[PDB]
Structure formats: structure tokens, C-alpha cells
Symmetry: D2
Subunit: 396 residues, 4 copies
């Protein structure tokens, strides 16, 4: 991060005047006196190469060239053997073809196998080569991209505010054009990964799939039907009447993480177990999602609420499409860009049962929002409980 | 959209009753008395009233649902239809729990009346925490190992030894292999499961930065070398630089593309045996050899020595204004002067060295993104041909 | 007509560049390009801009002669010493009367006729290291007697009790003197710059909005119109702090200073004013503190009628918001913040049902008028405010 | 901030009770019993329960507030004390009602116990609606006319006749008057009533663009001409250009400044201070823009400081994230190196040497820069004086 600080800070005397054109052969080449032009101009070789109007003249090139020939002459004999001369050429960028090497060994004429820089220079200048790089290298690693790209398709069926309403999911295999129904809970991957991640290996991964169940600014209850086939989203209707949060509107997109399972058979701490449900999340971005809408989010932290022996996590995340997404690096950043947000979310979950005659909620850690790494470990563990729920059903 | 700003239907402003969901197959009804005395719709009551529906209220709603399944209008339902009602209401019912139900209602004539159903419904409440979870799914596999692109600097800058090499680190096994940024980095960046709307087109390419924003030292993908690392452009041992002035945008190239000499743009103009060129215009300077996802927006066409040299205009998907640039026509709205400047630079860069102004295609016009993507596609096809015509 | 230009093709005129002009229009003969230009196959102007070398004395000569000629309108082949001074003047050479008599002497056109040659000869021998010696002090002399004030807010009492109060003051930034003000009467409605540098072609839309109920809260705070210096206070009933029971207000909710809707001015038939300042809903992503003041851009208004009184709810946005620039009118909201107008309207349509009320009645069927409409409502409100002060 | 992230005090989690607000002047109380029975605090029931407080609850609460005015515990209030308590509990009394209640309650012993107060309270309901509004006001009339900057281009670009003229249009009268960009455009942009947070430092300056981003033709404020319009750098009739390459940021001046080190008359080679605006948006020649100062770079010409202030336009998408010079490499990596590189070498092209910097090339922070600007603003006031 002090890469930033390097820019602001002053520079050494190497960076203010510039250096010699270097050989690239290391301490294996003897540090030289700059060429005459640099010395007369009072500008370094590299600065003259980079910014003077005229290109280096032939005598200047010869100087630089002999500094690079000498550099291969490690035992300091004052000459090179034809084979080293081909190395030099390959190093100068002129990748020669077998025909050429012998052609050059030939034209150079090493009257004793000894090629002096002078002899080289003379050959080099009489055989210019317009390097359009005629041969192209196909050497690749060629890995197999064994994967069928899918396009999610979301269909509404039935009527909202009635028992018929359902949001269904499908996958259109792109390489085959064929459609298949899928479970948003079991089939949409939890982690969103690229085939070839080009972001710096340095930057860790944080891109999760979020399934919206309750739209920002709404209060009508919807949920993943973990009981129904292909687990489509269904509205919460009891006795033909739709249910709602009575406390007020959910002020952030509220939903769940696919391929996750918090089990009432796995403990958090004595007395506290899981709630037999995918982990929930609240994405705080500015845009309202539609019911059942799926979006890529970034996890930032998690709030934990314990109710009747069951740990009920609330993951705080944010849509990668949100203008401020790039500035939220961890939970601690929500307050700076979204002041009061964490506070409202916690209060909402602390008091929402009061309205219908219940009490304030009991949280874990005295209501602390743990940081992203912790939220990710919850999600990860949950992913595993989900993989176990899948295995225990296969055989059974 | 403007549906939100526009006026509302008198059915929306006052509210509506609680529908059954069985369509016109239910006789439109009168609101329940309580909704009448309140002067508030049933739905608004269900949604916003501080209280839950009283039992008498739930019965009238439940009654309408019941009667809706009574399509003939007998005034009762066969136990199979009653079973259909329970399902509809979200109550799982198996031959077991089922039989015990008709044992409880007892319609000595199979005629289950609403009062007899309601009666039974109210005497068998069940906390539906849904005990049986459905595993039914498409369960797709994914034999893939995500690869981490690793970039490494080798040698020394401003000298003939500098190179940027590339590798794939298998995130599952951890093993690392050397790859050609030219041949192995995909041109098209695609999601394994695309969650964005099918109505939304794809426009997401990998761009390889060769010359950084605000600099002028030349570097290029060494198409001639094994695994084509990035090498610096050194001639006779002296580094080379644009003398006209600095490249003011990250300038670079698209992997898996090739414009071939052996192909014509139009009579007289061939390809130029290089991967296609790109100028990414976002605000962030990229490092040499750096790879990023870009949105393509259009292209400038330059012809020299009967050869076509395209300059694809693009913008990193991370740039703050990326989402607002939709096509080439949007660049002047947000980056006024940008295109003008990029064209002017390419129009005159050879003059300080004694050359002349350049000649463009279309009189210097920026073809739009659709034309630009085709230029990328074709060039991608040329790459495939280029690749076959070798192993073979 | 600015996008298009940068995208579109260029005239031959532009792609080849042109001659250095006299800048005196038709009064000058179109000329043939200088030979050095012709030998290069590069326009004169491209050469001066991009060639590595500066123009030589002979090239300058040709350029300066075309200029000189330009002043010689009737082609006499010479100029009067009087016109020569003009040329010197045009070339950027500040000439004090001393210099002028000197030039008339030093050239010496014993017949008043000064040829280009005589002129050129004189120019070359009296080189002048410009450095611009004399500074011009001419200027308008706008004065600012008044002192810049800083709005300061102090809190008194305990929040959620009848004693809490948000008091307003103006601190003189020069004296340090703090003086209590009324958010309602003293904070300016329109935010004005001393010198607007923003483009004139851009209509102003910058207002001060006083926040009463912060985003995501439900405690009823209000500007105390009946108390002196109208500080913010909470609504209390029978000693208990009042809250919205319908649910939290989901946007920053407040009012516009210097506005007023009187119960004595009609709007429609049997439609009066709320007898309060105009209320506002600011939709940015950021929650303000109770009584925090902010510049917002107005986007439209929604009109609620209740008991023959109009209850305007203006939709605006903090200029500080990341998408503020993109919402130019009410129609943009559904495009950047979909659901927002729906939710705001739905909220006000039903917030009273919770406490046994009925759904609200709206004007224009709840359509959201545009910003032109909102802005007319606001200016009117300012005049009722100006009249409310005069009547009193 | 991190307060939002951190755990909460057990009292916050549980919920607090309805306070007297009179501060410690009220005896801390037990939650009324119906609050105890709900296992929900008094304030949570008031803010979140569906129903209003029951009459027995309101009474218990009104009695805690009433007693809180009875600071010496007499057990009753004198009738002058009742008015206040009424307002406090939320009842707008009016001169007519006060007299009326001082009678109606009729404290036939001057004592108004709580029970008497309460009995009166329940038999008398007043429709507040607030009939009288307060017009008390500071009345800080600071009348002035809004001036709108108006810019006009004259002549032909790339020739001696191109000028950019500036004007003020009084938005009241609508009459225009030619002004000078150097002398008349405010260096400090100030709100006559600043509503932004007082704890937030002022940092808003006008920037007059001379050389647009990505261009290399030279323009400058004509310090020698009346109304100092912007002219093009023309010499012997040929327009001048930077030969190193294009300026890659908008380059211009700060109005009302003067970089001189010196009488009673005129002077020469000195200009307003130099600024480099680094936003993504190009500005036309002569365009003016509010900017945020971020730091500065100093070149020593020949014993003379040639400062270049780094700044960003307030309209830029990343303005808000750049708080000081150290923030630029974080959002515009390479931007400062590049600005430094450009100034280090722009004279090599034509046979000159690399420039030398003060502080080895360090970019001083915003504080140091606004200081340089202020001295320059003062230096400007002295010029203004000397001559006039
Ligand atoms: Mg849960
Ligand atoms: Mg190419
Ligand atoms: Mg109002
Ligand atoms: Mg300076």
C-alpha cells in the first residue's frame, strides 16, 4: 500500500538525472562511462534515448552495442566464439533460423573461430533485417475448458398475493440451447468464479450469488420453498391470506445464499443450534431487486441473532453492481459510506417481534457485526453442512 | 419505469380484495364486512393493519377459496377436491394424514361441506416448519479447476532481458504451468452460470496492457517467442519510445486474435500479422503486461502500406463510468475530447520522425461497438485458423 | 451535436491539416503552402504543432509576410507607419509611445511607405524577450461587504424526551460571533453562488433541505413552527414520545426553509394549504442526522389531499449523492432507483391504516409531477412565505 | 463509526425507559408495570408496539414528568408552574386557555397536586393544530446580486486574433459587464451561508483552464492586456506548442494570485500560480471550474520556485475520495509519478536539461499547497494596492 507513498515521496539521484543504457547482463558487465552525447548534454543516456528529438546516431549505437557484446565476453578475451555470437543475436532480438546461423557464421569469417566486436558490428550493419517477425510461436499450455456455460432464466407463474404464485428457475445450456429446470437453492453456485481469474492473485475472492426473497422497501413475505420440488420461491400464505412483517418495511434487499444449510443438528455453542435453513443475507446497495432476483454480491460481515436455541445469521453484503461497492472493503467501511446503516439493520432485527407482542431479540457478541472473514467462514461452513445434507439423502 | 411516475388505476389507489388465484373460475366477490366498515381494502388490511385477520375474517376468505374449487356450484366437494384444496393451501397431505382427515370430517355421502371442512381445518393446526426438505435438482457437475492468472517480471527493464511471463496456478491442486498470454488467456470472459438478464448482451473481454497510460516506452507481446511473453521493444540494444508524445490511455491487445496478411479488408488492404489493438480509456493506469476485463465500444481504422491497423476503443469494467458508456456515442458525453484526442494522436504520431499524417478508413470515423465486436470476432476466427494450420 | 462530431468522419480539411492563418479572414488572400511544407507533404499547421524542429527564420518570413499583406487591404504593396504599429500590436508586441516614435524613426519610411522588407528588417533587429513587462490592472470592482456565515447546530435536552431541541445559529466566519437563527426563516431556500461559474446554459436547481426524520428512523421530529427560532423538537402526546407506527421512513424526510402553504389560498375547488412548510423526501443513499441541512436538487412532487388540504411531498436528491448527476427529472428515478417512486407513494398511501385510518387520497391520481411542476410549487410556497411575513 | 460495528451496551440491547428529560432533576424510575410484564422496555413499547399506551400507562408516565417539575418534593405545583408542564407534555396552551385552566383546575389552595392536574387533563382535550406561528428571526438580509460568469471566444484559433473574453451577468438586472478572469473571478469559492459541516475544512477554488487535457497548443491569461482575456501563444505569427508531448491533465491558473518575489509601479515575467487538474474530464480553453486542492510540486527554475498545484474538479467521480495528496496514488496510481516525470523532462526534447525540484521531488500535502496559494493571494493583494 506504501506503493502509494512511493509516488508522493521524493526521488533518489538515480531517478532525477537518469542512468546509462544498461546491458541487462548484470554485474557481469563493467559499469561504463556514459557516451559523449550524454556527457555533453548533461542528460543521461536513458533520458536521451527516451526524450530527445533525434534517435541515437550510428556512432552512439556502436558504443551501446559494443558494451553488450563485451558483456558476453566474460573471461575478457576480446572476442566471442560463433556460438556465443548467435546467443548475442538472439539476445538483440534477431531470432535467426538454422539457415541464417550458418549463413552468418559463414559471412562473418572467424579466421580462428574468434569473432571480434568489430567483425560482428560490420556483419550486423551489412545484414540489416526488417524484423516483421515472420515466424509466429504457437507454444501454448492449451488447457481444456471442460465446462458448459449456462444462462439463468427466471419465470413467474401464478398470481402474487395468492397461493398460486411461484418464481421458477431454469438453465439454458448455451453450447446446446436446451432448457432445464433447476433449484435456485441447490443448482445456482454459491461462489461465483471465473474460468481464468485475471484479477491479481494478491486480491482475494469475494463474489457470491444472492437470491432475493424480499425486495428492498417491501414487507410482503416470500421464501425459497425448501419443501417443494425444485425449490421455487413461494409467497407466505396461511389460510388463504398473505403474510407480512408488521413492524414495517424491510429496508434492504433480503434473501439467501444458495448451497448453504444451517443445521438444527450442528452446534454453534451449547444450547444454540442451527435453524434448518439457508443462511440469510441483507444486501445494502441502493437498488431494489425483484422477487427471486439473483445477484453477485460481496460479503462484508454478519450479525448473529439467537432465538429459542437457534443461531440465525444475518449476512451483510452488497451487490457488485452498486456504485460504492469498490469502496466497501470490510464491515468497518459500511459506517463511513453508509452511516447509520449497520445501526438500522441491527435495530430492525432487534425489535421487529415486539410489534406483534414479542420481545427484543437476543444477539451473539452483544450485537456486534463480525468482519468479512468471519462471515465467509460461516458461509463456508454452511456450504459444507449443505454438501452433507446432499450426501445423507443420496443413500437414504 | 414511467409506470412508476404515472397516475394509478382506481383499483390501485384504494386497494383490492384477496384473490383466490383460481382466475375467473371464482365469482368476483364483495369485500368482507370488516373491510366495508373500515373503508380499507382486504389486502391493505392484511398488509398494513396493525392486527391479524380475526377468525371470522379468515373463514370468509377461506370460504371463497373453498367455493372456487366448487366449479359446478354443488355446495360441497368430493374428498379428492378437498385434498386438492389442502395442497393449494400449502398443507402437505399423504394417504396417511389424508385418510385420518376424512375420518374426521365424515361426509357419510362424500359431500364435504365448507362448514365441515372449516371445522376440521380449525381443529388440526400444524406448525409448518416443513420437516421434509426437497433434494430434487438438476445437480450439474463442474470438472473444472479454477485457474489463477499469474504474472511475473523477469530480467531488467530498459534492457534486452526484460520479459513478463504468465502462468496458470490451479487453485485446486496449486500446480503452476506457463501459458501464452496470446494463446491461453481467453478473449471472452464468460460466467459459468450467467445470472444477469438474458436480455443483456455480453460485452466482456480480456485486455493485455502493453503500454501504460501516460508513458511512451514501447513493449509488445512477443509473438515470435515461445509462450509469447511481453518483451520490451529494444533495437540494437537501445530501448524504443514513441517520440510524438506519451500514449494517454492504456494501449494494448486482445488475446486469441489475429489479423492476417493473407486476408483482405477491401481491395489493396490486408491484415498486418498482429493481434488486434486496443486503447482502454478509463482513468486507471495499468502496469505493463497487466490483464483486465474491458467493455468494447467502437473502433478506429488506420491503413498504412495497404495494411489495416484497427484501434478498438474500450473501457475497463472497473472504471467508475464503465456502466454509463453504452456504445461509442456515449464516449463524448462523459469523456468529451477523448475520441477526438485519440484520433488526433494516431493521425499525427509519425510526423515528428519525418513521416506524414495517417490515413483512416471511413474518413476517420469511430465505427460503433457492434462493428467493433465483429472485427474482434472475425479476428478471433482468424486466430483459430492460424492455430489449426500448424499442428496440422 | 457534440457526441456525433467526435464519432463522425472528418473533412479532408481536417485529416490533412491546414495553412497557418493570418486570422484576419477574407481580408487576406488564400495562400499556397510554404515549400518546406510542400516538400514534407504535411500541412503548415501540423508541422508547427508536431514536427520536432521549430520553424526557421525563412519559414517565419513567409508567414509574417502573409500577415503584413493582410493589413495591406487595397494591395498597395506597403503600409503606413500607423498601420505598422497596428501589426506590431496584433503580433503581441506591447508598444509604449516611446517605442512607437522610435520604430517610426528606426525604420524610416521617408515617404510614409513601409515595405514588408523594411518591416522585416526592423523586426529582426529589435528582438524582444517578451516576458510581458506591463500588467493590466483594469477590472470590474465588485465588493462584498457582508460576511460569510457558518450554520451551526447545537443539541439541548435528552433525545426522546420533551426537552430535546435542535437549535440553529450563524457563526460570522470573520468575527467569530454566534447568533441564533430560525431554520425555517433564516436558512436560504435557494443556494446561490456569489459568482456562478457553472455553465449559463444550465438552469439552476439547488435548494436547502432541512432534515427532520432521518432515513430508516420513525421518531417524529418536526420544525417547531410555533416556537421562537423554530428549533427541531419531537412530537409528544400525553408525555409519551411519538413514532410512526406504520414503519420507518425510508428516505431522509424534511422540509424546505422559507416556504409556506396557507389554509387561505386555494389550489383547486375546496382545496387549501397544509399551513406548514412544504415537506420533502430526499432519496440519496446517505442518512443525515436530525436537523442536518443539505443542498439538494429537486426532481418532482407527489400531491396528497387530506380534508380539503393539499399535502405536497417533494422528491429531491442530495447533490452529494453518487447518482445525483444522472437524475435530471422525475422520470430518471425509476431508471436508477427502481421501486423508489412506487415505495414512496405506497408509503404515504397507507401509513394511516395502521392506526385505523383509511388509505390516502392523491391529486392527479398520484402521478409524480415533474421538476418544473415541483419547482413552480416551491416558488409559490416562497411567496406565501413572503406574504406570511408581510401580513404579520 | 466503529461504534456502529461494535457490540452494544446491555442497556441498549434491552431497551431503555421513558425519560423525564429534565435530566437528573428527575428520580430514576422503575419501568411502569405493564412494561415489566411485557419484558419490553417503556421506550421500545412506545416506539414499536402496535397499540398506544393504555390510560393507566399514560397516567403513570405523566406522573413521572409532573413530579420532575416538583424539584423540592412539595407534592404539588403552584399554578404558574402548570403552564410549562402542559407544554412539556405536548399540549399547546394559549393565553385564553392558561387563564382558563388556572381557574378551571382552580387550585383553591394554590396547590395543584398531580391527581388534580390529571383530572383536569382528562376532562379537557385541546386540538393543538397550533393556531399561532412564530416569526421570530435573525433577519440577516445579505442582499447581493448573483453574478453568472459568461465566457466568449473571439477571433480565429491558431492565429493572433483568438481571445477568450469573460463577463459577469447580474442575474437580477440581467445586464452584462466585461470583467477580468485574473482579478475578478473569486480565488476562494464561498457560500454566503455555509450549511456544510463546520468541522469540515473549506477547500473549493476556481481553476481557469489554459491548456486542455490531451492537448499541446499553448494559451495563457494575457496579464498585459485590458480585462486579461485569454490569448494564444503566438510568436512571429506562428502558434507555439509543447514539443515534449501533450499535457495529460487540464493545465491552468488560480485567479487572484501572483507568483512574484518583489516597489510602486509595474513588473514583468510573473503569472498567477500554475495548477494541474487531474480529473477524467477535459476542459475547454478558458473554462472555469471549482477544484479541490491536494498538494504541490516545486521546481526551482534559477533560484526561483515554480510551484504546480495538484487539484481535482469537484465534479469528478473520485473527488470525494481524495482527501489529500497521499490519496492520489491510491485511486490514480501512476498519476503523480507521471506528472512529476512530465515536468522533469519536457525541456530535454529541444536540447535542455532535466528540471530540478525542491524537496527532491516530493509532492507537498494539501496544507502546504493552500499555503503557497495564500501567500500568492496576498502577493496578489499587494500588486493590486501598489498600483491603485
Ligand atoms: Mg435463517
Ligand atoms: Mg495491430
Ligand atoms: Mg407540509
Ligand atoms: Mg509558476
Amino acid at each position: 500500500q506504501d506503493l502509494a507513498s512511493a509516488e508522493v515521496a521524493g526521488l533518489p539521484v538515480s531517478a532525477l538525472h537518469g542512468t546509462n543504457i544498461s546491458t541487462g547482463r548484470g554485474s557481469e558487465a563493467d559499469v561504463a562511462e556514459p557516451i559523449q552525447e550524454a556527457v555533453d548534454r548533461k542528460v543521461s543516456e536513458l533520458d536521451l534515448a527516451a526524450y530527445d528529438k533525434d534517435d541515437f546516431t550510428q556512432p552512439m549505437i556502436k558504443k551501446i552495442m559494443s558494451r553488450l557484446f563485451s558483456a558476453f565476453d566474460v573471461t575478457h578475451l576480446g572476442y566471442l566464439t560463433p556460438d556465443k555470437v548467435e546467443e548475442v543475436c538472439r539476445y538483440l532480438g534477431r531470432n535467426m533460423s538454422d539457415g541464417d546461423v550458418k549463413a552468418m557464421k559463414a559471412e562473418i569469417n572467424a579466421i580462428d573461430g574468434h569473432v571480434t566486436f568489430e567483425k560482428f558490428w560490420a556483419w550486423w550493419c551489412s545484414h540489416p533485417v526488417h524484423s516483421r517477425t515472420k515466424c509466429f510461436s504457437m507454444v501454448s499450455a492449451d488447457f481444456s475448458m471442460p465446462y458448459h456455460q449456462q444462462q439463468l432464466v427466471v419465470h413467474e407463474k401464478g398470481e402474487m398475493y395468492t397461493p398460486s404464485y411461484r418464481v421458477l428457475y431454469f438453465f439454458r445450456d448455451l453450447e446446446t440451447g436446451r432448457e432445464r429446470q433447476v433449484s435456485p437453492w441447490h443448482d445456482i453456485p454459491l461462489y461465483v468464479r471465473d474460468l481464468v481469474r485475471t484479477k491479481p492473485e494478491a486480491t482475494p475472492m469475494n463474489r457470491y450469488n444472492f437470491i432475493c426473497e424480499i425486495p428492498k422497501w417491501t414487507r410482503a413475505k416470500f421464501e425459497i420453498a425448501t419443501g417443494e420440488s425444485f425449490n421455487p420461491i413461494k409467497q407466505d400464505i396461511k389460510n388463504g391470506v398473505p403474510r407480512f412483517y408488521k413492524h414495517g418495511d424491510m429496508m434492504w434487499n433480503y434473501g439467501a445464499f444458495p448451497q448453504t444449510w444451517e443445521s438444527t443438528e450442528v452446534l454453534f455453542e451449547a444450547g444454540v443450534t442451527g435453524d434448518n435453513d439457508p443462511v440469510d443475507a441483507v444486501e445494502i446497495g441502493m437498488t431494489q431487486f425483484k422477487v427471486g432476483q439473483v445477484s453477485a454480491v460481496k460479503v462484508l460481515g454478519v450479525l448473529g441473532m439467537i432465538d429459542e436455541g437457534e443461531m440465525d445469521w444475518k449476512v451483510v453484503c452488497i451487490s457488485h453492481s452498486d456504485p460504492i461497492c469498490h469502496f466497501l472493503r470490510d464491515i468497518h467501511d459500511v459506517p463511513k459510506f453508509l452511516p447509520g446503516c449497520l445501526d438500522a439493520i441491527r435495530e430492525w432485527f432487534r425489535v421487529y417481534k415486539i410489534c406483534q407482542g414479542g420481545e427484543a431479540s437476543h444477539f451473539a457478541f452483544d450485537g456486534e457485526f463480525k468482519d468479512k472473514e468471519y462471515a465467509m467462514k460461516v458461509i463456508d461452513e454452511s456450504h459444507n453442512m449443505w454438501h452433507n445434507l446432499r450426501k445423507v439423502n443420496k443413500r437414504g
